Amino acid sequence: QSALTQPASVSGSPGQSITISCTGTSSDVGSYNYVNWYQQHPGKAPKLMIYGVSKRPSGVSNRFSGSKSGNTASLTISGLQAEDEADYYCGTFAGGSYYGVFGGGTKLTVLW
Amino acid sequence: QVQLVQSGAEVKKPGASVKVSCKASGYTFTSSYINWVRQAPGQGLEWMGTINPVSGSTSYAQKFQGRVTMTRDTSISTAYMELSRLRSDDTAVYYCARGGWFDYWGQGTLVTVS
Amino acid sequence: ETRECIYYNANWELERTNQSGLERCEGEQDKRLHCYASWRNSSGTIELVKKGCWLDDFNCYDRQECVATEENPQVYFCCCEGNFCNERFTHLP
Secondary structure (H helix, E strand, O other): OOOOEOOOEEEEOOOOOEEEEEEOOOOOOOOOOOEEEEEEOOOOOOEEEEEOOOEOOOOOOOOEEEEEEOOEEEEEEOOOOHHHOEEEEEEEOOEOOEOOOEOOOEEEEEOO | OOEEEEOOOEEEOOOOOEEEEEEEEOOOHHHOOEEEEEEOOOOOEEEEEEEOOOOOOEEEOHHHOOOEEEEEEHHHOEEEEEEOOOOHHHOEEEEEEEOOOOOOEOOOEEEEEO | OOOEEEEEEOOHHHHOOOOEEEEEOOOOOOOOEEEEEEEEEOOOOEEEEEEEEEEOOHHHOOOOOEEEOOOOOOOEEEEEOOOOHHHOEEEOO
16 A cells, blocks of 8 residues: 655657656565556556566567666666657556555656 | 456436446456556546455455445456445546556546536 | 466356366466466355466465465455466465
């Protein structure tokens, strides 16, 4: 149930790399490889981009990668493109012994 | 392909109940959980709870404890989320998603409480 | 790694499945597969609910024994890794 904290927004230029952070504590992010990332375009349903901190589902662009350092999980977007403009949410695994939580989300703007 | 299809937009009076359906196809419905999430207008994703379709066991987020019921009908691969004693601020898009990783999401269901 | 599980379905009539056998796990290749066991324990006696393949679940990672941990539920459920691992199941009181 523990809160996950994300910055309200991040802006980038096309071709640049951007990193979105998801900060928890040593008892959540720092202990489990269960942090996931969701992309949400305006007026659409979320889509899973990265799960289990760093695992990429097939179909997802290789420009999306995930990592963890201490109590912060990070989503990195390489070679920023117009279609990356969306809201990004981090979240933890939900089911069985795990209670679900999402970060407050990050609005990513691509400035053309 | 894997798909979760939800029931349509619903309009409710405050104090009423709403039941949202989530139809699973392209995979064995009883091989994974169903998670429920909501998103109020211009707000973030909020976890509501999980159901295990094999056992029928549920886990609800603290916010909804006492007014959310999650069920399933395994004969039709359909999960249900019922939210009672509706309030004006329950106006949201409700989603179902597959398993603990929320790997596939339903299209969402707008529930307006007016 | 987990490709096959013990299969059981007590609700086979309404679900239009076989009652028992071996289930080959449908893997999307980019995800882990597990086996599961589910049953009712109404005062010592075991009434088997279902057994089969279970999709990528963090709770099941590297678990060779199928152990149900939910305290006093209506229905026990466990998952495990390895072929036919759901052959054996228990609950943790």
